Amino acid sequence: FHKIRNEDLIFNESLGQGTFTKIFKGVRREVGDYGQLHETEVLLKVLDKAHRNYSESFFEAASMMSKLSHKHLVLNYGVCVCGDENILVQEFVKFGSLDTYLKKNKNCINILWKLEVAKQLAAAMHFLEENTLIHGNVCAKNILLIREEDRKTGNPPFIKLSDPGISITVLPKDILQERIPWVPPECIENPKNLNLATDKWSFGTTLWEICSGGDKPLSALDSQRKLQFYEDRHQLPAPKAAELANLINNCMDYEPDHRPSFRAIIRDLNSL
Ligand SMILES: O=C(Nc1c[nH]nc1-c1nc2cc(CN3CCOCC3)ccc2[nH]1)NC1CC1
Question: Where does the protein end up?
């Protein structure tokens, strides 16, 4: 990881929170190409000091994204570990995370938009699967909208997958249960069951989000009822726009070895 000096970073407005993290828009002063000086808009992700003990995992989550280069994976610029701070410096995405975008724009998002976004996310996940690299936290909150759809120029939206954050293999059990139904049942049973098939299940949950205008599946159930939801082997209800419902349920298969490869997922999306 490239080291960035605290003096080169300016913190601006809070953009949100993650698990034990706070997110800010910022500016990085840097020497760029041809030696030209730039002030670049950056994403500053700060691990809470009270949870400094997660630092390794916090940074490892980003390292996974930095080992491979792909048009659908967020760019990591570096880290700032000056003083008592653990700061991840990433690219700033203009339109924010996909969950909020779906909630705010669900009245003007049609099936073609959801299909294109789904194809792009499946392409990112197929890239990861080919490299046998587990993400571990696929969800709408970890998808960023680089570009909006422009039907005037026939231009589709463009998304990137962001880093998973602190791994579910070290997170407290109550948080994992709160993350049902993104965390697959085998990982609720044993978080060390984290595998490539995890990402297929969570991909299904994320498709449900994309089809549900920003709603959170099972949000009305508390942790105990989410657990029992897995115990009784329920599936999510079909979204009102149910064009992808069968794909969602096929990905959210309680048998991990039966979850389809992302190549088959992509073939299914292209058939629709
Ligand atoms: O990783 C995240 N966000 C980002 C990573 N890279 N860039 C971002 C990001 N970029 C963001 C930009 C906005 C500004 N809004 C955008 C949509 O239109 C209204 C204003 C808000 C939040 C944003 N988050 N998680 C989101 C904060 C909870």
Answer: Endomembrane system; Cytoplasm; Nucleus
